[PDB]
Amino acid sequence: RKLISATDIQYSGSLLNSLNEQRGHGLFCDVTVIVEDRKFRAHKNILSASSTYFHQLFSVAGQVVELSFIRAEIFAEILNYIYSSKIVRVRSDLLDELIKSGQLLGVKFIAELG
Amino acid sequence: RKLISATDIQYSGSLLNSLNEQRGHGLFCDVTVIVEDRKFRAHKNILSASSTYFHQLFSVAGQVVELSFIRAEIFAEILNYIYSSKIVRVRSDLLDELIKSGQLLGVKFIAELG
């Protein structure tokens, strides 16, 4: 008569990495985000969960969203984070800009790097 | 002239928890799994990433999958893990059974509790 609990310390990382690979190939991706003229394919369940702006958007029909006021390479970073929990070796000047796009999109961790 | 990296230690947990809540309400869920006569709503991107059996299934059309040889309450646990990275206070006798369903579904961490 006993209870067992187990935690998979590596789960989160492998999941996220599989999910990031999925979006690299468009696997299971149900939305396309267009920034400047670059198109990012992605998963609504992930963006909704992690972004208050996308949370708002995806409570209604929509397969395409067009964003302004944010550069493609900056948005690329927001996604990389959304799909890894990390920003990695970002250059110090792009930071202020990155922080702002996090603010616009409601990605708390990016918004609050300052 | 400098590079910045940041890691969000809490990201994985919040993401997973938001995702688990989503499936509790069927939000963004694109598959239904029927075990015994219980129906579980879920996300293909998550199950594909985490289960080799579902990975196989979801490379083709299909909105419903019917499983046999696995009890509902046992499958419920596999999902809870898939959506938390943890099994929590599982009773010791159900374990052997849980391990087997992990084997059938190809959920490495569950398969390898022995």
UniProtKB/Swiss-Prot annotation, chains A, B:
The shown chain, on whole-protein numbering, covers 4 to 117 of 672
In which tissues has expression of this protein been reported?
Expressed in vascular endothelium.
Q: What does this protein do?
A: Transcriptional regulator with bimodal DNA-binding specificity. Binds to methylated CpG dinucleotides in the consensus sequence 5'-CGCG-3' and also binds to the non-methylated consensus sequence 5'-CTGCNA-3' also known as the consensus kaiso binding site (KBS). Recruits the N-CoR repressor complex to promote histone deacetylation and the formation of repressive chromatin structures in target gene promoters. May contribute to the repression of target genes of the Wnt signaling pathway. May also activate transcription of a subset of target genes by the recruitment of CTNND2.
Q: Which domain of life is it from?
A: Eukaryota
Query: Region annotation Self-association: residue ranges?
Result: 1-114
Q: What is this protein called?
A: Transcriptional regulator Kaiso
Annotated compartments: Nucleus; Cytoplasm
Q: From which lineage does this chain's organism come?
A: Eukaryota, Metazoa, Chordata, Craniata, Vertebrata
Map out region (Interaction with NCOR1) in residue numbers.
1-100
Which residues belong to any copy of the BTB domain?
29-91
Q: How does it assemble?
A: Self-associates. Interacts with CTNND2. Interacts with CTNND1, and this interaction inhibits binding to both methylated and non-methylated DNA. Interacts with NCOR1. Interacts with KPNA2/RCH1, which may mediate nuclear import of this protein. Interacts with CBFA2T3.
Reported induction: Induced in vascular endothelium by wounding. This effect is potentiated by prior laminar shear stress, which enhances wound closure.
